[PDB]
Amino acid sequence: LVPGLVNLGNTCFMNSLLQGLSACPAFIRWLEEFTSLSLTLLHLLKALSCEVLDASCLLDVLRMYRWQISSFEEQDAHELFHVITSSLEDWKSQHPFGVEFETTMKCTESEEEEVTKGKENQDSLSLSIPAAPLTLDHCLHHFISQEEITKQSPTLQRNALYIKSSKISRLPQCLCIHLQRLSWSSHGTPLKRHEHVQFNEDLRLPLAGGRGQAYRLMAVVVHHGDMHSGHFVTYRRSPPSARNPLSTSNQWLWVSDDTVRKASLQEVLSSSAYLLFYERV
Amino acid sequence: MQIFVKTLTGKTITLEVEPSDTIENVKAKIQDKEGIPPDQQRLIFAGKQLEDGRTLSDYNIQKESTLHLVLRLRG
């Protein structure tokens, strides 16, 4: 139901990412308005959102100007994602994936000290997987929850313990969640995290006062293998029918480079998610 | 000055740096605390991955800015 992408030289990290981005129609609409690398990207995503295509021209332009890699090594789809988003920037209007946080730092050791406020800007949320039921909702809750930070206190004139709290200040039309699947072992070595992290078709980002924003899952990039070698595939929604062009299909696809297959939702939800792409309802 | 790095588990560490510090110098300081070799570190600030050979000031990284650290999972 969609074109596959040929794997010329370990390019599944690109193919899988393009398959997922092409399932985000608000991102495609943003790109169309922005273009009214972007055009090279847009033309691929239009084709992939409705045969085998070749995405290598996008990699050629990226290698020329944005990312010094060779043409044939394995790479991280998440690193390519940030190369793409940061190439579009070169804040709100240039960041269709951008989440903003308002942060507050409160000194636990000096009740008189005034809190300081800060801002964080992110184009993906890189969640940590705790030690092993693992759920994306819990990882997200933990990411946004309060944390301890040590920093110099103007009032105490030494390092002191602070608590940082965060509130989401900007909601994007498109959302990329990155489940970190490389951790650092107790032996001082990298470790691939294979554990299933449960996720739903629907995701809610909380806001002040009980307000929140609902998002709907469009695609999942999955990494198979280890950090010495692996393979990326994508589960994505089919394009909508022409008679319901702004609807969201309930048909899912498994796409591994040049091969496209129908997949059940249950297969999608059972997969080992690495990047999850959502759009704001 | 101090900057903060959110590490692989979400714990946020604090580094002592200067605006003229190179990204390599910053990764070395992260290696001192976390044990992760610099060629395995991906550092992100405001969505942009930091490149070796540039300085914190090249990225407008100021006092008490926050970086995110992730590893590189290749396929």
Side-chain angles (χ1 to χ4, degrees), chain B residues 1-47 49-59 61-62 64-75:
Chain B
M1 58 194 198
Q2 295 180 315
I3 63 170
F4 306 116
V5 181
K6 187 162 195 74
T7 67
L8 300 184
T9 60
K11 176 175 91 143
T12 293
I13 62 176
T14 305
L15 306 179
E16 301 290 338
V17 294
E18 295 301 328
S20 59
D21 281 359
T22 63
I23 303 312
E24 290 104 303
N25 296 337
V26 170
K27 289 178 172 171
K29 288 167 207 224
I30 293 166
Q31 182 180 33
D32 292 340
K33 278 204 194 24
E34 300 297 300
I36 299 167
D39 74 351
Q40 287 179 46
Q41 295 179 29
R42 291 174 54 226
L43 300 186
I44 301 163
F45 176 63
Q49 187 168 305
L50 308 181
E51 307 182 21
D52 297 359
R54 318 217 190 251
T55 66
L56 292 178
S57 43
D58 291 343
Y59 293 102
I61 288 164
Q62 282 144 15
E64 288 179 15
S65 288
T66 300
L67 309 189
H68 284 66
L69 167 70
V70 300
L71 300 184
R72 180 178 295 106
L73 181 62
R74 296 177 190 268

